[PDB]
Amino acid sequence: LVPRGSAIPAEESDQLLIRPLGAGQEVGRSCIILEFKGRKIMLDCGIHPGLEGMDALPYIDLIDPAEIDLLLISHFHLDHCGALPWFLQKTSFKGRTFMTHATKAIYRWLLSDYVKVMLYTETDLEESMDKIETINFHEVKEVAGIKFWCYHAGHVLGAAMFMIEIAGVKLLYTGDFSRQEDRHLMAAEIPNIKPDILIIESTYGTHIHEKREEREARFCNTVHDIVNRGGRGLIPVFALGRAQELLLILDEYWQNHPELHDIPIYYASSAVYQTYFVFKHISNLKSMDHFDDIGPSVVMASPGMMQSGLSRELFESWCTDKRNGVIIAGYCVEGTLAKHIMSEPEEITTMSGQKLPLKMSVDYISFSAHTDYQQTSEFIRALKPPHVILVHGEQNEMARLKAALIREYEDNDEVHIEVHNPRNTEAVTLNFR
Ligand SMILES: CC(=O)c1ccc(-c2cccc(NC(=O)CCc3cccc4c3[B-](O)(O)OC4)c2)cc1
Ligand SMILES: [Cl-]
Ligand SMILES: [Cl-]
Ligand SMILES: [Fe+3]
Numbered sequence: 001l002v003p004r005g006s007a008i009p010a011e012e013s014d015q016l017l018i019r020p021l022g023a024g025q026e027v028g029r030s031c032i033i034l035e036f037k038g039r040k041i042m043l044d045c046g047i048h049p050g051l052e053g054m055d056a057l058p059y060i061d062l063i064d065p066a067e068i069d070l071l072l073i074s075h076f077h078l079d080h081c082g083a084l085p086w087f088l089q090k091t092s093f094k095g096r097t098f099m100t101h102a103t104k105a106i107y108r109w110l111l112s113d114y115v116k117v118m119l120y121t122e123t124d125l126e127e128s129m130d131k132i133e134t135i136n137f138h139e140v141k142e143v144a145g146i147k148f149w150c151y152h153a154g155h156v157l158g159a160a161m162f163m164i165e166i167a168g169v170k171l172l173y174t175g176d177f178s179r180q181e182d183r184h185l186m187a188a189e190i191p192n193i194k195p196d197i198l199i200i201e202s203t204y205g206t207h208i209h210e211k212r213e214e215r216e217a218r219f220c221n222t223v224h225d226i227v228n229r230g231g232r233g234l235i236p237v238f239a240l241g242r243a244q245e246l247l248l249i250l251d252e253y254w255q256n257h258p259e260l261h262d263i264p265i266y267y268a269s270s271a272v273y274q275t276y277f278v279f280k281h282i283s284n285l286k287s288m289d290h291f292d293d294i295g296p297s298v299v300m301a302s303p304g305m306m307q308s309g310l311s312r313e314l315f316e317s318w319c320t321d322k323r324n325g326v327i328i329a330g331y332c333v334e335g336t337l338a339k340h341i342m343s344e345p346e347e348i349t350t351m352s353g354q355k356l357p358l359k360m361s362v363d364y365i366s367f368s369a370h371t372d373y374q375q376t377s378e379f380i381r382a383l384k385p386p387h388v389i390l391v392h393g394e395q396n397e398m399a400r401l402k403a404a405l406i407r408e409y410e411d412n413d414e415v416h417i418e419v420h421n422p423r424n425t426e427a428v429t430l431n432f433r
C-alpha cells in the first residue's frame with residue numbers, strides 16, 4: 001500500500017501489526033497493540049466490568065511491557081483506563097503515557113473512588129500520576145519517532161480520538177465516540193486528514209439509535225409512571241459523564257410538571273467537570289446513611305451496572321416491590337447484574353447470597369453516547385480508509401457491522417475498503433511500501 005500522505009520503482013515493504021489484548025470481539029478492557037518499524041504503541045488500558053481480579057485485565061502477558069514506547073488513553077471510562085495504575089506500577093513498562101488534560105483531571109478522582117468500593121492500591125494510583133503526561137487537542141506530540149494528536153470524540157468530557165503517524169503511515173483510533181450533539185457535549189469531529197487505517201468501536205453494531213427527543217420522552221414518562229404509582233425509581237449511572245445529561249433532562253421535566261415538585265430526585269455521588277447544572281429539583285446525596293428512603297423518589301446512584309455499591313444496595317432494597325422500578329441508561333456488559341436482569345429472571349441473588357423475587361419494573365433506554373450504524377457509516381465514508389479494524393463490540397454485533405460495511409464498498413471503483421474483526425490476541429498485518 002502507498003501511504004495516502006505520499007510510477008517510481010517501489011523499495012521493500014514494511015509490515016504494520018495490530019493486535020487487541022482486550023476489546024477484541026468484546027466490550028470491556030480496551031487494549032490494542034500497534035507495531036510498526038520498531039515502534040510499539042498501546043491504545044487504552046482498561047478493565048472488563050463483568051470479570052473479577054486478574055481475569056478483568058487485558059491479555060498483557062502476551063507482550064513484553066518493557067518494549068512499549070507509547071501508551072495513549074482515549075477517555076476516563078474504566079474499560080479504557082481502569083488497568084492503568086496496575087500497568088504503570090506492577091509491570092516493566094517504562095514508556096510514555098498520554099491523556100487529555102480533562103481525562104487526567106477526572107481520572108485521578110475517579111479511580112480513587114473505584115479503589116474505595118485487588119489489582120492496585122491508592123498508593124499505586126498516586127505514585128503513577130506523575131508518569132502520565134497530558135496533551136491538548138489539535139497539538140502534535142512526538143515520542144520515539146511517533147507523531148500523534150487528537151480530535152474531540154464527543155461521548156464524555158475530555159474524550160479523544162488519536163491520530164498516529166509513523167513513517168508517513170497514519171492511523172486513527174476512535175476510542176468511544178458519538179456524532180450526536182448532547183445538551184452539554186459537542187459531537188465528535190470528522191478529521192480532514194485522511195488515515196490509512198481506522199480502528200473504530202462497534203458497540204451498537206448495525207442498530208440505529210432512536211431519535212433523541214423520543215428517548216428523552218420515554219425516559220421521562222417511565223420515571224413519571226414509577227413515582228406516580230408510589231414507587232422508588234432507581235437510575236444506575238457511572239459516577240460522571242452520562243449522568244449529567246440525565247439530570248438535565250429530569251430537572252427540565254420536573255420544572256414542567258408541578259404535580260411532581262414534592263417528589264425528590266437524589267444524585268448520589270462522591271467537581272472539575274464544571275471547571276472544564278445548578279438544578280432546581282435535584283439534591284445531592286452522600287451515602288445510603290444520608291438518605292431517607294421515603295417513597296416515592298428518584299435516586300441516581302453509582303455504579304452503572306449495579307455490580308456492588310450504592311446502586312446495588314438500593315436495587316436489593318427495592319426489587320421485591322412492584323411499585324418500584326429501575327431504568328438502565330447504559331450499555332449492559334455481559335457478566336453484570338444490569339445485563340442479567342434483561343432476561344427477566346424471576347429471582348435475583350443479593351451480594352450476601354440471599355434469593356429475592358424481582359418484582360420491580362425494569363426498563364432499558366440507552367443514553368450511552370456511542371456511534372450507531374448511520375453515524376459510523378457516514379464517518380467511514382468521509383474518511384475512506386483502505387483498512388478498517390473493528391473493536392469494542394460483542395461478537396455478533398461486530399460481525400453484522402463488518403458484513404454491512406463490506407457490502408457498502410463492493411461496487412466502489414474508487415476504493416475497496418477491507419474490514420477486520422480480530423479476536424483477542426489475533427493479529428491483523430498490513431504491508432506498506
Ligand atoms: C466492583 C465495582 O463496583 C465496579 C466494577 C467495575 C466497574 C467498571 C469497570 C469498567 C467499566 C465501567 N464503566 C464505565 O467505564 C462506564 C462507561 C461504560 C460502561 C459500560 C460499557 C461501556 C462503557 B463505555 O462508554 O466506555 O463503552 C462501553 C465500570 C465499576 C465498579
Ligand atoms: Cl523511518
Ligand atoms: Cl501472530
Ligand atoms: Fe466510554
Ligand SMILES: [Fe+3]
Nearest residue numbers: 077079176392
Ligand atoms: Fe468503552
